[PDB]
Design a protein around this ligand. Structure first.
Ligand SMILES: NC(=O)c1cc(F)cc2c1C(=O)N(C1CCN(C3CCC(F)(F)CC3)CC1)C2
Length: 351
């Protein structure tokens, strides 16, 4: 029997679910059974990015005819997909491109996550405890009546955007996070330390809790990244929550809060995929949203600023304008994961 707190057992059982990783890949037309992750080569994955680059080139230039169809055939050649019967579809928009780009990263990530959940040959220990141990990340459940849970719930509820009205969120449980090595590596020296959201797909959490949040790999096409290749956070809960991709069938998602050492922000009104180059001494990029929590409402939690809402207009306006801030850092050493929220999404049927 498991020696873990019951709340941790449920958390672990949820994120370590292998089926759920298979099903997420299958949704992106990758069959892990027909094509085991273990057989992908480094060079195969590199060739796949190479073809996604040719696809991106076509798309950015509005070329949807023959050059695009060949680039897509070359992509499907290099990366095995499973379409059931149908004609492999053309990769035509930014959303479909970007799904492919994320797919490629998840192939290596899911492969390592599935190795992580392997229990030892001999061991009497409950598998939950082995899974938990293998993450190398302490997850400490907090009581609902505690001050910290109340503050986090306010931050969750107060910063749910008024324009994300398709669901509410309930906080089911809150875990304080202590990832091995992160405290020692953290840029404790940098000013402007903020506690910020990061939402992600259920199958990504094994990789995040065992590796921390990572920048995208060198070979991925840069021009999909609106502010460069770093780690992205929101100060609005529902904006990160949108990246959980919860659904009615699986209405449970996770949100991560991290202390992020922002230092001096390079504040940018408009997207720039070359944003990291623009730093010249600064430490992060802030993409300037129209709406935002105001510093008058801010509290602190362990010396990070917690930007409580509600959001209000910031007088930023433009071309394109960001709805809400987002923050980017370019080294994991500016991040220290701190709370993980287990969240019930309640979807609404509105018209
Ligand atoms: N995950 C978050 O909580 C989050 C919060 C924010 F405020 C903003 C962002 C995220 C988040 O994950 N972001 C990702 C979403 C996906 N993009 C890229 C889109 C282009 C690509 F090529 F496919 C790579 C992925 C990179 C940024 C933005």
């Amino acid at each position: 029997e498991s020696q873990l707190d019951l709340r941790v057992q449920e958390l672990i059982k949820l994120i370590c679910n292998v089926q759920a990783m298979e099903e997420m890949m299958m949704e992106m037309k990758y069959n892990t059974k027909k094509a085991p992750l273990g057989k992908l080569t480094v060079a195969q994955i590199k060739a796949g990015y190479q073809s996604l680059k040719k696809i991106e080139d076509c798309i950015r230039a509005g070329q949807h005819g023959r050059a695009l169809m060949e680039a897509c055939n070359e992509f499907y050649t290099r990366i095995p997909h499973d379409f059931g019967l149908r004609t492999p579809p053309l990769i035509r928009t930014q959303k479909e491109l970007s799904e492919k780009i994320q797919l490629l990263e998840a192939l290596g990530d899911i492969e390592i996550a599935i190795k992580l959940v392997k229990t030892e040959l001999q061991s009497p220990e409950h598998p939950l405890d082995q899974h938990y141990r293998n993450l190398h990340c302490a997850l400490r459940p907090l009581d609902h009546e505690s001050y910290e849970f109340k503050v986090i719930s306010q931050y969750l509820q107060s910063t749910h955007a008024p324009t994300h009205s398709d669901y509410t969120m309930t906080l089911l449980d809150l875990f304080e996070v202590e990832k091995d090595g992160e405290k020692e590596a953290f840029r404790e020296d940098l000013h402007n330390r903020m506690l910020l959201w990061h939402g992600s797909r259920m199958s990504n959490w094994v990789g995040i809790l065992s590796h921390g949040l990572r920048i995208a790999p060198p070979e991925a096409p840069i021009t999909g990244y609106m502010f460069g290749k770093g780690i992205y956070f929101a100060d609005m809960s529902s904006k990160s929550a949108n990246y959980c991709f919860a659904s009615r069938l699986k209405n449970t998602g996770l949100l991560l809060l991290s202390e992020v050492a922002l230092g001096q922000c390079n504040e940018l009104l408009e997207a720039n995929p070359k944003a990291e180059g623009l730093l010249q001494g600064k430490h992060s990029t802030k993409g300037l949203g129209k709406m935002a929590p105001s510093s008058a409402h801010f509290v602190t939690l362990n010396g990070s600023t917690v930007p409580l809402g509600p959001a209000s207009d910031t007088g930023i306006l433009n071309g394109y304008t960001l709805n809400y801030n987002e923050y980017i850092v370019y080294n994991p050493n500016q991040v220290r994961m701190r709370y993980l929220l287990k969240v019930q999404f309640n979807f609404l049927q509105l018209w």
